[PDB]
């Protein structure tokens, strides 16, 4: 879906306490825009995007009041999951939820999402039809049965098709230029000696946004799949990203190609002195 909204929610049970730690993170097109954390000095949903700062105190109060209800929901659901899995209170357990919507090219609902995980594994997800559930294993069947028998999916369907699409439209309007915004990478090639009659040439991509990028290597214009080593895309911590790709090659005659949506055209690079 061209545009999306998600809420990533976590409840971690704290041994000894009646209350678990609850964290909720909102995203628009995978960029964080709001956050709630029950561990805060003043537990409240807070803006995490500048364009969100335009929202009034009735908005934050409402969202915070929701997070309070979610905190109780996850507290009870954690307690019940101990029973389904025959666990004791003495340990720490994790309940996660991902939910929201994707908008199509016509800005209409493409599809709604509602997924749950217990202990880092799929537990229960709402199907694309927004009425049927997929349970991951046998324990998850107890919840699926309790949810079919109460018709729980209807209430989620309504949020997903209504409020979700409504607020996503608002956030895209209020967030305007920052969504489509890009930063071109700054490419350079480093030279490192490897062994005898061989060298390692590393092609760095730095200061780019968004995180999507493609670095490749060529010898007389030919692609190199398995014989090329890279790192996973890593944040610089300033909002930009980094990535590198290297080839172990016997002692120019070697080119690197940088592909980023922020570039006017691809970048082609080679070793300096």
């Amino acid at each position: 879906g061209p545009h999306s909204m998600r809420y990533f929610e976590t409840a971690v049970s704290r041994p000894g306490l009646e209350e678990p730690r609850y964290i909720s993170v909102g995203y628009v097109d995978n960029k964080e825009f709001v956050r709630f954390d029950s561990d805060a000095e003043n537990p409240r949903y807070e803006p995490r995007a500048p364009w969100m700062e335009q929202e009034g105190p009735e908005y934050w109060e409402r969202e915070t009041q929701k997070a309070k209800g979610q905190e109780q929901w996850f507290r009870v659901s954690l307690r019940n999951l101990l029973g389904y899995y025959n666990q004791s209170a003495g340990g720490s357990h994790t309940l996660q939820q991902m939910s929201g919507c994707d908008l199509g090219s016509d800005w209409r609902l493409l599809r709604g999402y509602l997924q749950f995980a217990y202990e880092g594994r799929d537990y229960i997800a709402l199907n694309e039809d927004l009425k049927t559930w997929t349970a991951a294993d046998m324990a998850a069947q107890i919840t699926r049965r309790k949810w079919e028998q109460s018709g729980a999916a209807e209430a989620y369907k309504a949020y997903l098709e209504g409020e979700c699409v409504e607020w996503l439209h608002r956030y895209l309007k209020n967030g305007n230029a920052t969504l489509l915004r890009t930063d071109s990478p700054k490419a350079h090639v480093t030279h490192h000696p490897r062994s005898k009659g061989e060298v390692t040439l590393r092609c760095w991509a730095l200061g780019f946004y968004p995180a999507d990028i493609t670095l490749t290597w060529q010898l007389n214009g030919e692609e190199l799949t398995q014989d090329m080593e890279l790192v996973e895309t890593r944040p610089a911590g300033d909002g930009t990203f980094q990535k590198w790709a290297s080839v172990v090659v016997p002692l120019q005659n070697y080119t690197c190609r940088v592909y980023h949506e922020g570039l006017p055209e691809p970048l082609t690079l080679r070793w300096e002195p």
């Binding site: 409402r62 019940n80 729980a152 209430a155 989620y156």
Partner: peptide, 9 residues
């Protein structure tokens, strides 16, 4: 805007 879950697990 976030949603509030219904029936517990």
């Amino acid at each position: 805007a976030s949603n509030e879950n219904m029936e517990t697990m």
